[PDB]
Amino acid sequence: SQTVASHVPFADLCSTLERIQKSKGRAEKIRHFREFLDSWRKFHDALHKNHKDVTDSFYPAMRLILPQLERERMAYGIKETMLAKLYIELLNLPRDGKDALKLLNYRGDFAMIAYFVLKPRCLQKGSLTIQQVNDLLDSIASNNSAKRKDLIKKSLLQLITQSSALEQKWLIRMIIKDLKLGVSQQTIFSVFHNDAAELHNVTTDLEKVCRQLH
């Protein structure tokens, strides 16, 4: 009950973001984003067929696809260096080791390095819905607005331990706020809008046509 975001897995979104960035060309990129759009609406329909009158707000997902436009949540307070010490301990790898130093370096991006050491170690499924990921990102920003780095770590741990490595790859970019999709926000907005207006736009309905065009 309650929302679409509460029923769609975080994994679905990450699955899509992967297929987007991995593809060459604006065409295949749009196809994949549109797939997610279509999926979202399919969930909505299934909920209403099951008598749960949810809203189909895409915002829970849009806010993660375009994390650098996030303005409801405040700053995460998660410096990219804080992340390294957490992963070192989470699987208890030795400091100044092969994988330990790679994450302790700086600049593809940090997320691609974390994924490189997470893929063979798993602790995966994952489990989180999008709403729950959002709920945890909310708590991180709140813990940071209140100057509680300890609570940031705990909240952060909760996402990690419950996320697959692919899932973790994308969280990190959502936190750092650079997705690197290879498709602009302008087109994302267009596809999103065009998707809606192709559906919810009066074309041949005479009663609605006559009233509106006056």
Side-chain angles (χ1 to χ4, degrees), residues 2-18 20-21 23 25-48 50-84 86-87 89-90 93-94 97 99-100 108-115 117-118 120 122-124 126-146 148 150-152 154-179 181-199 202-207 209-210 213:
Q2 146 218 135
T3 77
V4 168
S6 93
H7 288 269
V8 178
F10 183 45
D12 276 28
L13 170 60
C14 294
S15 170
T16 301
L17 296 178
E18 191 66 6
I20 290 178
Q21 77 137 26
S23 33
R26 188 137 102 192
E28 196 184 354
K29 261 146 178 41
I30 281 166
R31 199 173 83 224
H32 293 305
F33 169 58
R34 199 178 277 279
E35 288 186 331
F36 190 75
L37 242 27
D38 294 341
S39 183
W40 195 262
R41 152 167 299 106
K42 176 190 70 178
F43 275 93
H44 169 96
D45 289 339
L47 263 352
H48 287 233
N50 278 277
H51 301 94
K52 310 237 161 281
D53 186 21
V54 293
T55 213
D56 62 339
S57 180
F58 189 61
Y59 171 75
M62 193 70 88
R63 86 195 300 196
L64 274 3
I65 295 173
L66 301 167
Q68 66 290 23
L69 304 182
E70 178 50 63
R71 68 207 249 173
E72 208 201 1
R73 280 195 286 276
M74 294 298 89
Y76 290 135
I78 307 191
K79 268 58 186 186
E80 341 203 29
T81 354
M82 179 194 310
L83 290 177
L86 274 210
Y87 275 117
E89 160 100 300
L90 196 271
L93 50 75
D99 298 272
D109 64 341
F110 175 79
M112 216 52 171
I113 305 178
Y115 183 45
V117 317
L118 276 166
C122 289
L123 216 275
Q124 294 190 109
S127 349
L128 272 0
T129 84
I130 283 177
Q131 172 156 321
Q132 300 187 301
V133 170
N134 268 313
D135 276 346
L136 260 15
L137 289 184
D138 284 359
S139 286
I140 284 168
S142 291
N143 290 329
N144 182 64
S145 290
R148 294 289 292 272
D150 56 321
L151 298 178
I152 295 181
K154 301 183 74 68
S155 300
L156 190 42
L157 251 328
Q158 292 181 48
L159 281 172
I160 299 319
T161 65
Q162 301 178 82
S163 288
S164 74
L166 192 60
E167 280 182 329
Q168 289 171 70
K169 174 189 174 173
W170 292 101
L171 276 180
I172 293 187
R173 296 189 178 175
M174 291 164 201
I175 309 269
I176 293 306
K177 297 185 177 184
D178 204 318
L179 243 65
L181 264 23
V183 49
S184 86
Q185 4 161 323
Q186 284 82 350
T187 47
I188 282 152
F189 284 149
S190 284
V191 178
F192 172 69
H193 170 279
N194 292 335
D195 189 270
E198 287 150 21
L199 301 174
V202 48
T203 59
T204 51
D205 187 309
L206 284 182
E207 275 195 286
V209 166
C210 286
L213 292 185

PDB file of all heavy atoms in Angstrom, residues 20-49, unseen atoms left out:
ATOM      1  N   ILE A  20      21.883   1.947 -19.041  1.00  0.00           N
ATOM      2  CA  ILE A  20      22.004   3.283 -19.626  1.00  0.00           C
ATOM      3  C   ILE A  20      23.451   3.712 -19.874  1.00  0.00           C
ATOM      4  O   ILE A  20      23.825   4.066 -21.002  1.00  0.00           O
ATOM      5  CB  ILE A  20      21.371   4.351 -18.707  1.00  0.00           C
ATOM      6  CG1 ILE A  20      19.849   4.212 -18.670  1.00  0.00           C
ATOM      7  CG2 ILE A  20      21.773   5.770 -19.148  1.00  0.00           C
ATOM      8  CD1 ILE A  20      19.185   5.212 -17.727  1.00  0.00           C
ATOM      9  N   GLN A  21      24.257   3.716 -18.814  1.00  0.00           N
ATOM     10  CA  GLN A  21      25.623   4.203 -18.932  1.00  0.00           C
ATOM     11  C   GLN A  21      26.432   3.265 -19.812  1.00  0.00           C
ATOM     12  O   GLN A  21      27.321   3.714 -20.529  1.00  0.00           O
ATOM     13  CB  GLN A  21      26.295   4.382 -17.562  1.00  0.00           C
ATOM     14  CG  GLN A  21      26.770   3.088 -16.901  1.00  0.00           C
ATOM     15  CD  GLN A  21      28.153   3.221 -16.277  1.00  0.00           C
ATOM     16  OE1 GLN A  21      28.570   4.311 -15.896  1.00  0.00           O
ATOM     17  NE2 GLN A  21      28.875   2.107 -16.187  1.00  0.00           N
ATOM     18  N   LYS A  22      26.100   1.973 -19.762  1.00  0.00           N
ATOM     19  CA  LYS A  22      26.820   0.950 -20.520  1.00  0.00           C
ATOM     20  C   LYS A  22      26.547   1.046 -22.013  1.00  0.00           C
ATOM     21  O   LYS A  22      27.356   0.592 -22.825  1.00  0.00           O
ATOM     22  CB  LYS A  22      26.464  -0.459 -20.034  1.00  0.00           C
ATOM     23  CG  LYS A  22      27.590  -1.194 -19.318  1.00  0.00           C
ATOM     24  N   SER A  23      25.411   1.626 -22.388  1.00  0.00           N
ATOM     25  CA  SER A  23      25.094   1.716 -23.807  1.00  0.00           C
ATOM     26  C   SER A  23      25.764   2.892 -24.528  1.00  0.00           C
ATOM     27  O   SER A  23      26.017   3.946 -23.946  1.00  0.00           O
ATOM     28  CB  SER A  23      23.581   1.673 -24.060  1.00  0.00           C
ATOM     29  OG  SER A  23      22.852   2.273 -23.022  1.00  0.00           O
ATOM     30  N   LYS A  24      26.081   2.681 -25.798  1.00  0.00           N
ATOM     31  CA  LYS A  24      26.582   3.761 -26.626  1.00  0.00           C
ATOM     32  C   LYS A  24      25.405   4.367 -27.384  1.00  0.00           C
ATOM     33  O   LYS A  24      24.611   3.637 -27.993  1.00  0.00           O
ATOM     34  CB  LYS A  24      27.654   3.245 -27.600  1.00  0.00           C
ATOM     35  N   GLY A  25      25.276   5.692 -27.326  1.00  0.00           N
ATOM     36  CA  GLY A  25      24.283   6.390 -28.130  1.00  0.00           C
ATOM     37  C   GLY A  25      23.066   6.892 -27.380  1.00  0.00           C
ATOM     38  O   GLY A  25      22.620   6.282 -26.404  1.00  0.00           O
ATOM     39  N   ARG A  26      22.525   8.013 -27.848  1.00  0.00           N
ATOM     40  CA  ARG A  26      21.374   8.628 -27.205  1.00  0.00           C
ATOM     41  C   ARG A  26      20.136   7.729 -27.342  1.00  0.00           C
ATOM     42  O   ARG A  26      19.275   7.695 -26.451  1.00  0.00           O
ATOM     43  CB  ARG A  26      21.112  10.043 -27.759  1.00  0.00           C
ATOM     44  CG  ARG A  26      20.031  10.846 -26.993  1.00  0.00           C
ATOM     45  CD  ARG A  26      20.414  12.318 -26.743  1.00  0.00           C
ATOM     46  NE  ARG A  26      19.749  13.259 -27.653  1.00  0.00           N
ATOM     47  CZ  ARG A  26      20.078  14.548 -27.790  1.00  0.00           C
ATOM     48  NH1 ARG A  26      21.073  15.068 -27.080  1.00  0.00           N
ATOM     49  NH2 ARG A  26      19.419  15.325 -28.644  1.00  0.00           N
ATOM     50  N   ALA A  27      20.059   6.990 -28.448  1.00  0.00           N
ATOM     51  CA  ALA A  27      18.904   6.136 -28.715  1.00  0.00           C
ATOM     52  C   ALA A  27      18.722   5.028 -27.677  1.00  0.00           C
ATOM     53  O   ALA A  27      17.704   4.972 -26.991  1.00  0.00           O
ATOM     54  CB  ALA A  27      18.971   5.552 -30.124  1.00  0.00           C
ATOM     55  N   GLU A  28      19.703   4.140 -27.581  1.00  0.00           N
ATOM     56  CA  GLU A  28      19.622   3.032 -26.651  1.00  0.00           C
ATOM     57  C   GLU A  28      19.506   3.550 -25.212  1.00  0.00           C
ATOM     58  O   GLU A  28      18.829   2.938 -24.385  1.00  0.00           O
ATOM     59  CB  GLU A  28      20.830   2.103 -26.815  1.00  0.00           C
ATOM     60  CG  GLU A  28      20.647   0.728 -26.180  1.00  0.00           C
ATOM     61  CD  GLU A  28      21.891  -0.145 -26.271  1.00  0.00           C
ATOM     62  OE1 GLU A  28      22.872   0.266 -26.939  1.00  0.00           O
ATOM     63  OE2 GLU A  28      21.886  -1.240 -25.664  1.00  0.00           O
ATOM     64  N   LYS A  29      20.149   4.681 -24.921  1.00  0.00           N
ATOM     65  CA  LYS A  29      20.047   5.286 -23.584  1.00  0.00           C
ATOM     66  C   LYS A  29      18.575   5.598 -23.255  1.00  0.00           C
ATOM     67  O   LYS A  29      18.091   5.261 -22.190  1.00  0.00           O
ATOM     68  CB  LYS A  29      20.913   6.563 -23.469  1.00  0.00           C
ATOM     69  CG  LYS A  29      22.295   6.426 -22.780  1.00  0.00           C
ATOM     70  CD  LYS A  29      23.319   7.384 -23.449  1.00  0.00           C
ATOM     71  CE  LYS A  29      24.724   7.375 -22.826  1.00  0.00           C
ATOM     72  NZ  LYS A  29      25.237   6.036 -22.450  1.00  0.00           N
ATOM     73  N   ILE A  30      17.873   6.234 -24.187  1.00  0.00           N
ATOM     74  CA  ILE A  30      16.471   6.613 -24.012  1.00  0.00           C
ATOM     75  C   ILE A  30      15.578   5.394 -23.889  1.00  0.00           C
ATOM     76  O   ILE A  30      14.716   5.342 -23.022  1.00  0.00           O
ATOM     77  CB  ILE A  30      15.985   7.468 -25.201  1.00  0.00           C
ATOM     78  CG1 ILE A  30      16.468   8.909 -25.041  1.00  0.00           C
ATOM     79  CG2 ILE A  30      14.458   7.403 -25.348  1.00  0.00           C
ATOM     80  CD1 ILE A  30      16.330   9.765 -26.297  1.00  0.00           C
ATOM     81  N   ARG A  31      15.800   4.423 -24.767  1.00  0.00           N
ATOM     82  CA  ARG A  31      15.087   3.160 -24.743  1.00  0.00           C
ATOM     83  C   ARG A  31      15.069   2.586 -23.333  1.00  0.00           C
ATOM     84  O   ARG A  31      14.002   2.268 -22.808  1.00  0.00           O
ATOM     85  CB  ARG A  31      15.748   2.166 -25.696  1.00  0.00           C
ATOM     86  CG  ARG A  31      14.870   0.991 -26.103  1.00  0.00           C
ATOM     87  CD  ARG A  31      15.536   0.130 -27.180  1.00  0.00           C
ATOM     88  NE  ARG A  31      16.482  -0.849 -26.635  1.00  0.00           N
ATOM     89  CZ  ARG A  31      17.690  -1.095 -27.142  1.00  0.00           C
ATOM     90  NH1 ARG A  31      18.125  -0.430 -28.208  1.00  0.00           N
ATOM     91  NH2 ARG A  31      18.471  -2.007 -26.575  1.00  0.00           N
ATOM     92  N   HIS A  32      16.249   2.477 -22.723  1.00  0.00           N
ATOM     93  CA  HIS A  32      16.392   1.919 -21.379  1.00  0.00           C
ATOM     94  C   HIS A  32      15.719   2.762 -20.294  1.00  0.00           C
ATOM     95  O   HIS A  32      15.151   2.217 -19.347  1.00  0.00           O
ATOM     96  CB  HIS A  32      17.873   1.701 -21.031  1.00  0.00           C
ATOM     97  CG  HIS A  32      18.543   0.645 -21.853  1.00  0.00           C
ATOM     98  ND1 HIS A  32      18.060  -0.646 -21.943  1.00  0.00           N
ATOM     99  CD2 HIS A  32      19.658   0.678 -22.619  1.00  0.00           C
ATOM    100  CE1 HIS A  32      18.844  -1.353 -22.732  1.00  0.00           C
ATOM    101  NE2 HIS A  32      19.825  -0.574 -23.157  1.00  0.00           N
ATOM    102  N   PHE A  33      15.803   4.084 -20.411  1.00  0.00           N
ATOM    103  CA  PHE A  33      15.167   4.952 -19.427  1.00  0.00           C
ATOM    104  C   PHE A  33      13.655   4.823 -19.544  1.00  0.00           C
ATOM    105  O   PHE A  33      12.938   4.746 -18.543  1.00  0.00           O
ATOM    106  CB  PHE A  33      15.592   6.409 -19.617  1.00  0.00           C
ATOM    107  CG  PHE A  33      14.776   7.391 -18.813  1.00  0.00           C
ATOM    108  CD1 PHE A  33      14.696   7.282 -17.429  1.00  0.00           C
ATOM    109  CD2 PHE A  33      14.101   8.436 -19.446  1.00  0.00           C
ATOM    110  CE1 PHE A  33      13.947   8.204 -16.675  1.00  0.00           C
ATOM    111  CE2 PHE A  33      13.343   9.353 -18.711  1.00  0.00           C
ATOM    112  CZ  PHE A  33      13.273   9.244 -17.315  1.00  0.00           C
ATOM    113  N   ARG A  34      13.189   4.797 -20.784  1.00  0.00           N
ATOM    114  CA  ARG A  34      11.781   4.628 -21.092  1.00  0.00           C
ATOM    115  C   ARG A  34      11.262   3.277 -20.578  1.00  0.00           C
ATOM    116  O   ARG A  34      10.116   3.175 -20.144  1.00  0.00           O
ATOM    117  CB  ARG A  34      11.567   4.743 -22.600  1.00  0.00           C
ATOM    118  CG  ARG A  34      10.155   5.027 -22.990  1.00  0.00           C
ATOM    119  CD  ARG A  34      10.033   5.163 -24.475  1.00  0.00           C
ATOM    120  NE  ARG A  34      10.394   6.498 -24.934  1.00  0.00           N
ATOM    121  CZ  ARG A  34       9.574   7.547 -24.891  1.00  0.00           C
ATOM    122  NH1 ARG A  34       8.334   7.415 -24.411  1.00  0.00           N
ATOM    123  NH2 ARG A  34       9.987   8.726 -25.340  1.00  0.00           N
ATOM    124  N   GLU A  35      12.113   2.252 -20.627  1.00  0.00           N
ATOM    125  CA  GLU A  35      11.782   0.932 -20.090  1.00  0.00           C
ATOM    126  C   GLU A  35      11.439   1.064 -18.624  1.00  0.00           C
ATOM    127  O   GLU A  35      10.468   0.486 -18.147  1.00  0.00           O
ATOM    128  CB  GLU A  35      12.955  -0.043 -20.241  1.00  0.00           C
ATOM    129  CG  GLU A  35      13.234  -0.513 -21.673  1.00  0.00           C
ATOM    130  CD  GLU A  35      14.320  -1.583 -21.764  1.00  0.00           C
ATOM    131  OE1 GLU A  35      15.240  -1.612 -20.908  1.00  0.00           O
ATOM    132  OE2 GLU A  35      14.253  -2.393 -22.713  1.00  0.00           O
ATOM    133  N   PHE A  36      12.242   1.841 -17.912  1.00  0.00           N
ATOM    134  CA  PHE A  36      12.006   2.046 -16.502  1.00  0.00           C
ATOM    135  C   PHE A  36      10.702   2.813 -16.301  1.00  0.00           C
ATOM    136  O   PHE A  36       9.915   2.488 -15.411  1.00  0.00           O
ATOM    137  CB  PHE A  36      13.177   2.778 -15.864  1.00  0.00           C
ATOM    138  CG  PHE A  36      13.117   2.812 -14.372  1.00  0.00           C
ATOM    139  CD1 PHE A  36      13.426   1.673 -13.628  1.00  0.00           C
ATOM    140  CD2 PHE A  36      12.748   3.976 -13.703  1.00  0.00           C
ATOM    141  CE1 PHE A  36      13.370   1.687 -12.238  1.00  0.00           C
ATOM    142  CE2 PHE A  36      12.693   4.005 -12.318  1.00  0.00           C
ATOM    143  CZ  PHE A  36      13.003   2.856 -11.582  1.00  0.00           C
ATOM    144  N   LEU A  37      10.474   3.822 -17.136  1.00  0.00           N
ATOM    145  CA  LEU A  37       9.239   4.598 -17.077  1.00  0.00           C
ATOM    146  C   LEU A  37       8.026   3.689 -17.235  1.00  0.00           C
ATOM    147  O   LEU A  37       7.070   3.779 -16.465  1.00  0.00           O
ATOM    148  CB  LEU A  37       9.238   5.660 -18.175  1.00  0.00           C
ATOM    149  CG  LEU A  37       9.187   7.119 -17.734  1.00  0.00           C
ATOM    150  CD1 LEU A  37       9.799   7.287 -16.354  1.00  0.00           C
ATOM    151  CD2 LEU A  37       9.937   7.977 -18.738  1.00  0.00           C
ATOM    152  N   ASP A  38       8.090   2.809 -18.232  1.00  0.00           N
ATOM    153  CA  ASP A  38       7.008   1.883 -18.535  1.00  0.00           C
ATOM    154  C   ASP A  38       6.802   0.923 -17.374  1.00  0.00           C
ATOM    155  O   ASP A  38       5.677   0.536 -17.059  1.00  0.00           O
ATOM    156  CB  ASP A  38       7.304   1.085 -19.822  1.00  0.00           C
ATOM    157  CG  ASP A  38       7.339   1.964 -21.086  1.00  0.00           C
ATOM    158  OD1 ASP A  38       6.794   3.091 -21.062  1.00  0.00           O
ATOM    159  OD2 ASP A  38       7.914   1.514 -22.110  1.00  0.00           O
ATOM    160  N   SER A  39       7.904   0.543 -16.744  1.00  0.00           N
ATOM    161  CA  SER A  39       7.882  -0.398 -15.638  1.00  0.00           C
ATOM    162  C   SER A  39       7.162   0.222 -14.442  1.00  0.00           C
ATOM    163  O   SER A  39       6.299  -0.405 -13.819  1.00  0.00           O
ATOM    164  CB  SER A  39       9.317  -0.746 -15.258  1.00  0.00           C
ATOM    165  OG  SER A  39       9.377  -1.712 -14.229  1.00  0.00           O
ATOM    166  N   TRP A  40       7.532   1.460 -14.138  1.00  0.00           N
ATOM    167  CA  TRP A  40       6.933   2.227 -13.057  1.00  0.00           C
ATOM    168  C   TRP A  40       5.416   2.218 -13.163  1.00  0.00           C
ATOM    169  O   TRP A  40       4.706   1.968 -12.178  1.00  0.00           O
ATOM    170  CB  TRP A  40       7.431   3.664 -13.145  1.00  0.00           C
ATOM    171  CG  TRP A  40       7.193   4.480 -11.924  1.00  0.00           C
ATOM    172  CD1 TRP A  40       6.174   5.357 -11.720  1.00  0.00           C
ATOM    173  CD2 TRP A  40       8.002   4.517 -10.735  1.00  0.00           C
ATOM    174  NE1 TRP A  40       6.295   5.944 -10.482  1.00  0.00           N
ATOM    175  CE2 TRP A  40       7.409   5.445  -9.855  1.00  0.00           C
ATOM    176  CE3 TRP A  40       9.166   3.856 -10.330  1.00  0.00           C
ATOM    177  CZ2 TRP A  40       7.933   5.728  -8.586  1.00  0.00           C
ATOM    178  CZ3 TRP A  40       9.693   4.140  -9.072  1.00  0.00           C
ATOM    179  CH2 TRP A  40       9.072   5.067  -8.215  1.00  0.00           C
ATOM    180  N   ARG A  41       4.927   2.491 -14.369  1.00  0.00           N
ATOM    181  CA  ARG A  41       3.506   2.580 -14.592  1.00  0.00           C
ATOM    182  C   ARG A  41       2.854   1.190 -14.502  1.00  0.00           C
ATOM    183  O   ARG A  41       1.709   1.057 -14.074  1.00  0.00           O
ATOM    184  CB  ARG A  41       3.239   3.272 -15.924  1.00  0.00           C
ATOM    185  CG  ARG A  41       1.932   2.873 -16.619  1.00  0.00           C
ATOM    186  CD  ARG A  41       1.596   3.823 -17.758  1.00  0.00           C
ATOM    187  NE  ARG A  41       1.424   5.192 -17.267  1.00  0.00           N
ATOM    188  CZ  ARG A  41       2.300   6.179 -17.451  1.00  0.00           C
ATOM    189  NH1 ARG A  41       3.418   5.962 -18.139  1.00  0.00           N
ATOM    190  NH2 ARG A  41       2.051   7.386 -16.955  1.00  0.00           N
ATOM    191  N   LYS A  42       3.596   0.152 -14.874  1.00  0.00           N
ATOM    192  CA  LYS A  42       3.084  -1.210 -14.795  1.00  0.00           C
ATOM    193  C   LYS A  42       2.866  -1.613 -13.329  1.00  0.00           C
ATOM    194  O   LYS A  42       1.889  -2.299 -12.997  1.00  0.00           O
ATOM    195  CB  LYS A  42       4.033  -2.185 -15.495  1.00  0.00           C
ATOM    196  CG  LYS A  42       3.621  -3.650 -15.380  1.00  0.00           C
ATOM    197  CD  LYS A  42       4.712  -4.605 -15.865  1.00  0.00           C
ATOM    198  CE  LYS A  42       5.913  -4.624 -14.930  1.00  0.00           C
ATOM    199  NZ  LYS A  42       6.936  -5.606 -15.402  1.00  0.00           N
ATOM    200  N   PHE A  43       3.778  -1.182 -12.460  1.00  0.00           N
ATOM    201  CA  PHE A  43       3.602  -1.367 -11.015  1.00  0.00           C
ATOM    202  C   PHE A  43       2.351  -0.656 -10.476  1.00  0.00           C
ATOM    203  O   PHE A  43       1.553  -1.263  -9.743  1.00  0.00           O
ATOM    204  CB  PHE A  43       4.846  -0.913 -10.246  1.00  0.00           C
ATOM    205  CG  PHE A  43       5.920  -1.972 -10.143  1.00  0.00           C
ATOM    206  CD1 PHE A  43       6.945  -2.042 -11.085  1.00  0.00           C
ATOM    207  CD2 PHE A  43       5.899  -2.905  -9.106  1.00  0.00           C
ATOM    208  CE1 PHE A  43       7.926  -3.017 -10.996  1.00  0.00           C
ATOM    209  CE2 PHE A  43       6.879  -3.880  -9.007  1.00  0.00           C
ATOM    210  CZ  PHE A  43       7.895  -3.936  -9.955  1.00  0.00           C
ATOM    211  N   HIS A  44       2.199   0.621 -10.844  1.00  0.00           N
ATOM    212  CA  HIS A  44       1.013   1.427 -10.527  1.00  0.00           C
ATOM    213  C   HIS A  44      -0.279   0.700 -10.869  1.00  0.00           C
ATOM    214  O   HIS A  44      -1.189   0.583 -10.029  1.00  0.00           O
ATOM    215  CB  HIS A  44       1.054   2.757 -11.296  1.00  0.00           C
ATOM    216  CG  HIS A  44      -0.228   3.536 -11.235  1.00  0.00           C
ATOM    217  ND1 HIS A  44      -0.440   4.553 -10.327  1.00  0.00           N
ATOM    218  CD2 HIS A  44      -1.366   3.445 -11.961  1.00  0.00           C
ATOM    219  CE1 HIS A  44      -1.645   5.056 -10.498  1.00  0.00           C
ATOM    220  NE2 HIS A  44      -2.230   4.402 -11.484  1.00  0.00           N
ATOM    221  N   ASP A  45      -0.356   0.208 -12.107  1.00  0.00           N
ATOM    222  CA  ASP A  45      -1.544  -0.498 -12.581  1.00  0.00           C
ATOM    223  C   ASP A  45      -1.812  -1.754 -11.766  1.00  0.00           C
ATOM    224  O   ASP A  45      -2.970  -2.083 -11.465  1.00  0.00           O
ATOM    225  CB  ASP A  45      -1.417  -0.862 -14.063  1.00  0.00           C
ATOM    226  CG  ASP A  45      -1.516   0.352 -14.976  1.00  0.00           C
ATOM    227  OD1 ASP A  45      -2.063   1.390 -14.535  1.00  0.00           O
ATOM    228  OD2 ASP A  45      -1.047   0.264 -16.136  1.00  0.00           O
ATOM    229  N   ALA A  46      -0.735  -2.453 -11.413  1.00  0.00           N
ATOM    230  CA  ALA A  46      -0.862  -3.713 -10.692  1.00  0.00           C
ATOM    231  C   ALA A  46      -1.371  -3.441  -9.278  1.00  0.00           C
ATOM    232  O   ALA A  46      -2.182  -4.202  -8.746  1.00  0.00           O
ATOM    233  CB  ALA A  46       0.470  -4.485 -10.676  1.00  0.00           C
ATOM    234  N   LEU A  47      -0.909  -2.339  -8.687  1.00  0.00           N
ATOM    235  CA  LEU A  47      -1.382  -1.944  -7.367  1.00  0.00           C
ATOM    236  C   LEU A  47      -2.889  -1.618  -7.370  1.00  0.00           C
ATOM    237  O   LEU A  47      -3.630  -2.060  -6.497  1.00  0.00           O
ATOM    238  CB  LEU A  47      -0.538  -0.781  -6.818  1.00  0.00           C
ATOM    239  CG  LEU A  47       0.633  -1.021  -5.835  1.00  0.00           C
ATOM    240  CD1 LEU A  47       0.761  -2.452  -5.323  1.00  0.00           C
ATOM    241  CD2 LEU A  47       1.944  -0.549  -6.404  1.00  0.00           C
ATOM    242  N   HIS A  48      -3.339  -0.874  -8.372  1.00  0.00           N
ATOM    243  CA  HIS A  48      -4.735  -0.488  -8.424  1.00  0.00           C
ATOM    244  C   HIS A  48      -5.613  -1.684  -8.749  1.00  0.00           C
ATOM    245  O   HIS A  48      -6.782  -1.737  -8.333  1.00  0.00           O
ATOM    246  CB  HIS A  48      -4.951   0.674  -9.396  1.00  0.00           C
ATOM    247  CG  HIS A  48      -4.442   1.986  -8.880  1.00  0.00           C
ATOM    248  ND1 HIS A  48      -5.224   3.118  -8.821  1.00  0.00           N
ATOM    249  CD2 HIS A  48      -3.236   2.336  -8.375  1.00  0.00           C
ATOM    250  CE1 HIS A  48      -4.518   4.112  -8.316  1.00  0.00           C
ATOM    251  NE2 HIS A  48      -3.310   3.660  -8.034  1.00  0.00           N
ATOM    252  N   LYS A  49      -5.047  -2.655  -9.456  1.00  0.00           N
ATOM    253  CA  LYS A  49      -5.769  -3.888  -9.722  1.00  0.00           C
ATOM    254  C   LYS A  49      -5.888  -4.720  -8.435  1.00  0.00           C
ATOM    255  O   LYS A  49      -6.807  -5.543  -8.302  1.00  0.00           O
ATOM    256  CB  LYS A  49      -5.103  -4.675 -10.853  1.00  0.00           C
ATOM    257  CG  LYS A  49      -5.662  -4.367 -12.239  1.00  0.00           C
TER     258      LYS A  49
END
